[PDB]
Design an enzyme around this catalytic site. Structure first.
Site, PDB file in Angstrom:
ATOM      1  CG  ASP A 191       8.364  36.664  33.460  1.00 28.85           C
ATOM      2  OD1 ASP A 191       7.494  36.905  32.866  1.00 28.85           O
ATOM      3  OD2 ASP A 191       9.282  37.442  32.974  1.00 28.85           O
ATOM      4  CB  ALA A 192       7.052  35.561  39.945  1.00 30.41           C
TER       5      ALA A 192
END
Ligand SMILES: [Mg+2]
Ligand SMILES: [Zn+2]
Ligand SMILES: [Zn+2]
Lengths: 45, 68, 473, 101, 49, 33, 49, 335, 560
Positions: C160-161
């Site tokens: 999630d980056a």
């Protein structure tokens, strides 16, 4: 110092302290303030 | 709000290609693809700048506080 | 809800009724008078039998529905191709679309409210929806059309980056501004007194002093100046004796003013753009000043993907990196490809294919629900321009120069910047009350513990067996 | 003479030449790759590798490792002089094509 | 063997009640995975009885 | 060009939202009040 | 030597808060429960918790 | 290793250059400056005022990537750095409008300037050989000869749209005659910086200094700098007929052709191929075509911003990449 | 009324970010919160040379101090209002300064929904740019980090004795296992698995222009490696990809690391069903490591990283200490992050599209299973059916249709994986570890099947039926909760509503679970709290009342 600006007729008026704060031309109840005449510094990055 | 000067990815100046685009839309009536093709840009990058852009400043200048 | 009546073989709404509708007259409520459509209730459509489409006319049917994609709401209609995703990723986006920042109104520069976020260069989405044209979302969009290479790069993108591009956010990708309001009222106390404003004091040729160099001769912060730490932008003085009621006498005691101004505090400096005077309802002065702050995207600012693929910024990467698809297009945000199988959002994958082939022949496409642009004739548009049918381009790596050994899915995605930046969440405390690093006081039913040590965390250090860390903490 | 541009790390090198490492400040992948390729073409150099430990700094650690009879502080100077020769070859063949057309 | 621990306790006794409670916890967790290394279950089934 | 039936049925939804709005559940109550 | 060293280091060390470890080793797999209707029966004969 | 490479339908192979002494038993391909001067050469396709296209053969990917990387950062250029405002009463905020003055490209040779020393105070960093001052002063006025209707803000409003041509260069300091031969202008004078209405006025002053493109995007001297390896279509089993015309409708119209009154197709002007490998999914064209690209050939295509000619950017990049190697060999290695 | 409670000085709370260049025992603290979070240091013989310059630098320069407490207790004089250079000149031996947080300081690091004892670890500090608490991803698994803008807490100890009880029995290197089962809970993660499956893939052969760069990207330059002779010779000198992981376990002769385990990985094919070797498999399969040398098998989630008792770092940890296992974890974590950006790995729409052969089998085999369940509907209104003894005549129709519609999604779900081409993203991610299974790729590509709620199928939302688009008394699969379109083709509106119900069922069981994040574990903590083993190998209570004579009947630590 040019302290007042009407929000409707945009008349460059100014009056001193406690002198019936309103517009002397139309009669609007709120007043804005003009931009300063000094020099502000920014960075274009 | 206004068209950006440079495109985000590579950096080619697309700010010079907005009024000439709106001139090709109204007069000399073409679709957006061909009139944006014979205007410069070949890549789909920097083509997206003129295609998907909303002009908010024409609506913002109707609320001019310096006049009436 | 209004549905179309059928009469035992076929629909009542014929072809001749719809020709007048798009040509002026015979609008809605002229179809209720002629008995073509009618309103049905929830327990009243239980006695009905409704068809989905027009190639379904069975003589045992009673009604016909107008549109299948009316099931999605107003906020829920921002998702392109919702019938390709799974449903939780259709729900999370409904909480992420309302948090995205952008243009709010046409008079958003003419109003003073307590907090609003703006976007410098908003862009309309690439693939639209047939329900976002009626709510006028394409006139006030909230987001940015990025260009995305879906690949694993630099390792600061694990879960999630997203990684960002330097020399792309330097050219205005994600510049926002935050406007906050400070309001004061000059109270008229009962014992014939006021609280006045004023100032302009100097000390040894300083015109004025450092704490005062944002105020004019009136005492209010003038338009255009900057404000930083403890400098004062509204100089206010209240009387120190007329708090109780000393009943009115003509004694000269009104020259006692204890000043109590408002003071700007913050990590990064702000700017003054509006200040307004008022003489409001009960003849009482009101001062409203607005402070704006221009923010740029940095490490910690989160983004969405219009499908529920929210994530935080990992690193701002140089422009000489980010492989460059021989024509020369550098990606703007590189996304980890591992977020797709566990979350099952393939409707995002169509958004590039109907987006990359949407830029080329100058047509903004339609990603409406239960329809939209077909994947078959959008790969045909993509393939006769000289590209792959599936959007996989071949890249040339930046830090080594050689080719990349896999074809990498490239194309534009309408991203959007949210709230919840890192600049107003960095909260720290050394010793004593009134902590030195104070976040902005907008929680709103979000008290997630704070700087405390709960009973669940007291039980963790028992399990380690540390006895002096207990007495220390 | 700048004594901070290039260093030589103490607890990485062996004795008498061979298996040396170098720390160059204010450098990116450009000279790292362009110097990794030239020193690898030296037939007495058999482990030449660059790296950057952290992306928000300006460091470059390059390790040069030979077998024998060539000190790696000399193998760095040999592969750094040849890059000047390659840049002499490139800007001489390119200029005459601008001139002749 | 029943599921009710007090039903075993009223008929069999204390020592036969812990031997059922170390396996009823072992049954409701091994039907999902999640090995809890049964000495922990034996410590749970001993502080209760 | 040619008016179909399965595609022109879509135009029932703009003509619904032009006469009565989307925020009619608040407007109609205060107007009836 | 390996089989005696891996057994002599394997004993429980005196002073270990073994109640706190056993209380968290049971409750933490308990916090990942969905519904998960199963049965200790044939074709849906009993609904067991 | 395994020359000119193959394009596979699901991957691509033979990526590494691997021409070093230690690839095999025989010590092949040493440095040998006399061999590299013989093998390397440059072709040129076109040279325009703001666009250059040229080719380099028999050369590694590594130092060509090095040239491509330091075309962008290390080549210096000028842009607006500091902007001083006077009575900005328009609708655009003074950080947005200051950000768009930096992004415009200025047309001046950056060799006439000196690098800013940041250790000096504010009244000493800027001097005659360091700073280019630009001045803007636009006040909007209502046009008295109003038309029959409110059509557009072009009419019935004097100078409501500012442009990049309104950035007047002021001759600063002492040396007002060195820039008198060629005064600094923007590369394109039609850049819409702001839209105005009557009652509004923009007055400012920008100080333009020298910088590198790795510090900020506004100092980037080139818009696009990239390469492509030359593709190659090795066709075998020479089929013809209706399948030859089906073989033509896939590819772009100028990369292969059908012979007129004679035998099968061939390859003409393979330079114009954009590799989409769409002939690798048919099952009719399986062992009858061989896609790939040659690893030695590079097609540099540079499009600059307008500050300098693109035939100067490549030479300046070769000069910069040479200078950082001779600067490193004249430093003592400190333990 | 059992809420958080206590308020603790010297703490911060900031969001988190990825950083595998940082070690597993470190958390990078930015220079904006490592200026007010101080540490009290007493001056002595061995810090007078540093604390003087630390006072001279002041509070604005980051290697500095804020406050100063004299030995005779004058006041707590801050280093801000006066008191220049001369204040550092005296510096009596009992003074206590409050220095800024620096590199190497012990700090503990927390996430607020703390489940078990691996929610509060201890780290070293590192001073960095932009204002976030970035940390490595080999340690994010015990914190349950899914980063997406989640905040975490940070506490610094303020004495010399509690600072030692965090780095010795509480830090990261001493807690590589979980105490719940003894398995390694804190190990390699998501993108570090697929970067190891692509190196150790059999079709990868390297060279000294590439192998040297791979060895230099895993140990950031400085490490002396001993290059082994290659696995391929005289035609082309080629080093295999399994000789890279054979090399990072034991780089040179100085490291004593000899690893001799063998284990089978994820999904495995029997070799010939006669061959007693377990490693003659059709796939890569069974892994042999003999003397820090991988002989066969890829490095997926089973062999490498989180999982069972047969991990690589688990063997290094049991055999050669925790520091060497931490070094090997750091080495692979900074190998994969540099390699996978230079290899390239994407998914796209190409890797989800069926290649015109699965569609024929989906059109054929589903219509065989619709016919074998619709015949039970026309037999249901023929009186009764053959009632199974476990239930009545109504529940024996739900169970058979549910069994056939659960069987139809796996016989289509296994003919999709066989026709699926290699070198694609989701089949590799299902064959290796981190995310994605065969169920997810069969649900994207082939067919989605039988959206169930509350155990059974969907009930009647209206009277006698679910949706008003189907007739009354219609128990057909397309009417009662069996989707048949995959996610690539697109769902119909009843299929969309049936999927939305089953999605919102699992979506609401997570939001209400956060209210019960510790209610059972805190109540169970009320009794199992004051129990420790005494020195006579007996576990007792606080009042010395004995509860069990030996732990578990044998006295064995389940962690070791
Ligand atoms: Mg999260
Ligand atoms: Zn007025
Ligand atoms: Zn571009």
């Amino acid at each position: 110092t040019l302290k007042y600006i009407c929000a409707e007729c945009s008349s460059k008026l100014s009056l001193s302290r406690t002198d019936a704060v309103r517009c002397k031309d139309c009669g609007h109840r709120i007043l804005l303030k003009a931009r300063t005449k000094r020099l502000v510094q920014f960075e274009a990055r | 709000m206004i068209v950006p000067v440079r495109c985000f990815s590579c950096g080619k100046v697309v700010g010079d290609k907005w009024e000439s685009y709106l001139n090709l839309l109204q007069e000399d009536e073409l679709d957006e693809g061909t009139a944006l093709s014979r205007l410069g840009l070949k890549r789909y990058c920097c083509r997206r700048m003129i295609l998907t852009h909303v002009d908010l400043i024409e609506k913002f200048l109707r609320y001019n506080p310096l006049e009436k | 809800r209004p549905l179309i009546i059928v009469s035992d073989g076929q629909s009542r709404v014929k072809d001749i009724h719809l020709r007048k509708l798009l040509d002026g007259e015979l609008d809605f409520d002229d179809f209720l008078k002629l008995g073509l459509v009618e309103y049905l209730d929830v327990n009243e459509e239980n006695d009905s039998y409704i068809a989905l489409y027009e190639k379904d006319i069975v003589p045992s049917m009673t009604h016909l529905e107008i549109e299948p994609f009316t099931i999605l709401g107003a906020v829920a209609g921002l998702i392109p191709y919702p019938h390709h995703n799974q449903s939780p990723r259709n729900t999370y986006q409904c909480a992420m679309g309302k948090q995205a920042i952008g243009a709010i109104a046409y008079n958003q520069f003419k109003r003073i409210d307590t907090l609003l976020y703006l976007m410098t260069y908003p862009q309309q989405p690439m693939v639209k929806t047939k329900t976002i044209e009626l709510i006028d979302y394409d006139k006030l969009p909230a987001g940015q059309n990025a260009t995305v290479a879906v690949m694993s790069y630099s390792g600061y993108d694990i879960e999630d980056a997203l990684v960002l591009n330097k020399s792309s956010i330097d050219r205005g990708f994600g510049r926002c501004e935050t406007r906050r309001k400070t309001t004061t009222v000059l109270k008229r106390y009962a014992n014939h007194t006021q609280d006045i404003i004023g100032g302009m004091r100097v000390d040894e040729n300083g015109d004025p002093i450092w704490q005062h160099q944002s105020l004019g001769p009136d005492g209010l912060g003038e338009v255009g100046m900057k404000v930083q730490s403890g400098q004062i932008y509204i100089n206010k003085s209240v009387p120190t004796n007329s708090a109780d009621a000393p009943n009115p006498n003509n004694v000269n005691v009104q020259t006692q003013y204890r000043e109590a101004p408002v003071i700007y505090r913050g990590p990064e400096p702000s700017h003054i753009d509006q200040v307004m005077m008022s003489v409001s309802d009960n003849d009482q002065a009101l001062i409203k000043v607005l402070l704006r702050q221009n923010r740029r995207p940095e490490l910690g600012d989160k983004f969405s993907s219009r499908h529920g693929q929210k994530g935080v910024c990992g690193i701002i990467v140089k422009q000489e990196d980010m492989p460059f698809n021989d024509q020369g297009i550098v990606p703007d945000i590189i996304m980890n490809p591992h977020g797709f199988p566990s979350r099952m959002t393939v409707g995002k994958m169509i958004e590039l294919i109907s987006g990359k082939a949407g830029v080329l022949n100058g047509t903004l496409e339609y990603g409406t629900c239960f329809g939209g642009s077909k994947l078959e004739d959008m790969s045909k548009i993509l393939v006769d321009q000289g590209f792959n049918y599936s959007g996989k381009d071949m890249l040339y790596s930046g830090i080594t120069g050689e080719c990349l050994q896999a074809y990498i899915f490239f194309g534009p995605i309408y991203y959007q910047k949210l709230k919840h930046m890192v600049l107003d969440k960095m909260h720290a405390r050394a010793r004593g009350p009134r902590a030195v690093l104070t976040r902005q006081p907008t929680e709103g039913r979000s008290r997630d513990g704070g700087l405390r040590l709960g009973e669940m965390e007291r039980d963790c250090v028992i399990a380690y067996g540390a006895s002096q860390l207990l007495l220390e903490r | 003479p700048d004594r901070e541009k290039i260093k030589l790390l103490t607890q990485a090198t062996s004795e008498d030449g061979t298996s040396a490492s170098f720390q160059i400040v204010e450098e990116d992948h450009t000279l790292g790759n362009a110097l990794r390729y030239v020193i690898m073409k030296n037939p007495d150099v058999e482990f030449c590798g660059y790296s950057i430990p952290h992306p928000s700094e300006n460091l470059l650690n390059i390790r040069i490792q030979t077998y024998g009879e060539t000190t790696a502080v000399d193998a760095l100077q040999k592969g750094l002089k040849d890059l000047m020769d390659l840049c002499d070859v490139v800007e001489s063949k390119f200029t005459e094509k601008i001139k002749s057309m | 063997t029943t599921n009710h621990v007090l039903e075993v306790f009223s008929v069999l006794g204390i020592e036969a009640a812990r031997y059922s409670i170390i396996r009823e916890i072992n049954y409701t967790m091994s039907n999902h995975g999640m090995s809890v290394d049964p000495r922990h279950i034996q410590l749970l089934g001993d502080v209760m009885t | 060009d040619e008016i179909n039936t399965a595609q022109d049925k879509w135009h029932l939804l703009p003509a619904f939202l032009k006469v009565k709005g989307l925020v009619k559940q608040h407007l109609d109550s205060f107007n009836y009040f | 030597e390996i089989a005696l060293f891996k057994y002599r280091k394997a004993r429980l060390e005196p002073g270990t808060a073994i109640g706190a470890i056993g209380a968290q080793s049971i409750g933490e797999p308990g916090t990942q429960m969905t519904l998960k209707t199963f049965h200790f029966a044939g074709v849906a004969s009993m609904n067991v918790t | 290793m395994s020359n000119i490479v193959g394009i596979e339908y699901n991957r691509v192979t033979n990526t590494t250059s691997t021409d070093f002494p230690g690839f095999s038993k025989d010590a092949e391909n040493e440095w040998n400056v006399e061999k590299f001067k013989k093998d390397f050469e440059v072709n040129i396709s076109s040279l325009d005022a703001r666009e250059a296209n040229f080719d380099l053969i028999n050369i590694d990917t590594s130092i060509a990537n090095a040239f491509r990387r330091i075309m962008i950062s290390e080549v210096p250029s000028v842009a607006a750095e500091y902007v001083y405002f006077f009575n900005n009463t328009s609708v655009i905020q003074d950080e947005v409008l200051a950000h768009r003055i930096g992004l415009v490209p200025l047309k001046v040779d950056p060799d006439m300037l000196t690098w800013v020393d940041s250790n000096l105070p504010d009244d000493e960093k800027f001097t005659d050989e360091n700073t280019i001052v630009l001045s803007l002063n636009v006040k909007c006025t209502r046009n008295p000869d109003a038309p029959k209707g409110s059509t557009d803000p072009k009419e019935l409003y004097n100078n409501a749209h500012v442009y990049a041509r309104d950035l007047k260069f002021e001759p600063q300091g002492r040396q007002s005659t060195t820039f008198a031969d060629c005064p600094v202008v923007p590369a394109d004078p039609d850049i819409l910086l702001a839209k105005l209405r009557p009652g509004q006025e923009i007055s400012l002053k920008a100080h333009c200094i020298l910088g590198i493109g790795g510090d900020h995007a506004k100092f980037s001297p080139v818009s696009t700098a990239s390469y492509r390896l030359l593709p190659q279509i090795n066709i075998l089993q020479p089929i013809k007929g209706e399948s030859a015309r089906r073989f033509q409708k896939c590819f772009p119209p100028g990369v292969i052709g059908i012979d007129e009154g004679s035998d099968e197709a061939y390859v003409k002007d393979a330079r114009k191929d954009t590799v989409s490998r769409e002939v690798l999914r048919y099952e009719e064209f399986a062992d009858k075509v061989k896609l790939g690209r040659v690893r030695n050939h590079f097609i540099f295509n540079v499009e600059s911003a307008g500050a300098m000619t693109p035939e100067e950017i490549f030479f300046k990049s070769v000069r910069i990449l040479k200078n950082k190697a001779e600067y490193l060999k004249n430093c003592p290695i400190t333990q | 009324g059992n809420l958080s409670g206590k308020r603790v000085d010297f703490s911060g709370r900031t969001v988190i970010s990825p950083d595998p260049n940082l070690s597993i025992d470190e958390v990078a603290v930015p220079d904006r919160v490592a200026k007010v979070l101080t540490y009290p240091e007493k001056v002595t013989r061995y810090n007078r040379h540093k604390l003087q310059e630390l006072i001279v630098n002041g509070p604005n320069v980051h290697p500095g101090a804020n406050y100063l407490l004299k030995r005779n207790e004058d006041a707590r004089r801050n280093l801000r209002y006066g008191d220049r250079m001369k204040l550092a000149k005296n510096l009596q031996i009992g003074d206590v300064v409050e220095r800024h947080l620096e590199d190497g300081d012990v700090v503990l690091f927390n996430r607020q929904p703390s489940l078990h004892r691996l929610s509060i670890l201890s780290h070293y500090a590192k001073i960095r740019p932009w204002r976030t608490f970035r940390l490595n991803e080999c340690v994010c698994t015990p914190y349950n980090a899914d980063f997406d803008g989640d905040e975490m807490n940070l506490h610094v100890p303020q004495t010399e004795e509690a600072r030692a009880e965090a780095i010795n029995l509480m830090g990261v290197k001493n807690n590589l296992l979980t105490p719940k089962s003894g398995e390694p809970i804190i190990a390699a993660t998501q993108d570090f698995i697929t970067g190891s499956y692509l190196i150790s893939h059999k079709d990868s052969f390297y060279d000294r222009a590439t192998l040297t760069q791979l060895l230099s990207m895993m140990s950031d330059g400085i490490e002396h490696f001993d290059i082994p002779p290659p696995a391929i010779m005289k035609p082309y000198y080629l080093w295999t990809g399994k000789q890279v992981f054979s090399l990072l376990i034991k780089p040179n002769h100085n490291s004593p690391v000899v690893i001799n385990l063998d284990a089978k990985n994820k999904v495995f094919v029997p070799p010939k069903s006669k061959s007693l070797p377990n490693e003659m498999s059709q796939n890569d399969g069974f892994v042999i490591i003999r003397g820090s040398q991988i002989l066969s098998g890829v490095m997926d989630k089973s062999v490498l990283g989180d999982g069972k008792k047969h991990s690589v770092f688990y063997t290094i940890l049991r055999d050669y200490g925790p520091q060497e296992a931490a070094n090997a974890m750091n080495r692979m974590a900074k190998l994969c992050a540099r390699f996978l950006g230079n290899r390239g790995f994407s998914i796209g729409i190409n890797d989800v599209t069926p290649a015109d052969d699965l569609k024929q089998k989906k059109e054929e085999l589903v219509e065989i299973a619709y016919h074998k369940c619709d015949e039970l509907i026309t037999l249901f209104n023929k009186g009764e059916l053959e009632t199974q003894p476990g239930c009545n005549e109504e529940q024996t129709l739900e169970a058979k249709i549910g069994g056939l519609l659960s069987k139809v999604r796996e016989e289509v779900g296994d003919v999709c994986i066989n026709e699926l081409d290699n070198w694609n993203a989701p089949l590799i991610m299902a064959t290796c570890g981190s995310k994605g299974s065969t169920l997810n790729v069969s649900q994207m590509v082939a067919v989605v099947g039988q959206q169930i709620i509350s155990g059974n199928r969907v009930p009647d939302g209206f009277q006698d039926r679910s949706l008003p688009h189907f007739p009354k008394n219609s128990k057909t699969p397309q009417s009662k909760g069996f989707v048949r379109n995959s996610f690539f083709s697109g769902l119909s509106p009843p299929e969309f509503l049936f999927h939305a119900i089953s999605g919102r069922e699992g979506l609401v069981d997570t939001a209400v679970k956060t209210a019960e994040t510790g209610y059972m574990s805190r109540r169970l903590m009320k009794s199992l709290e004051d129990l420790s083993c005494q020195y006579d190998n007996t576990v007792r209570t606080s009042a010395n009342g004995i509860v069990q004579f030996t732990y578990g009947g044998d006295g064995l630590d389940p962690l070791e």
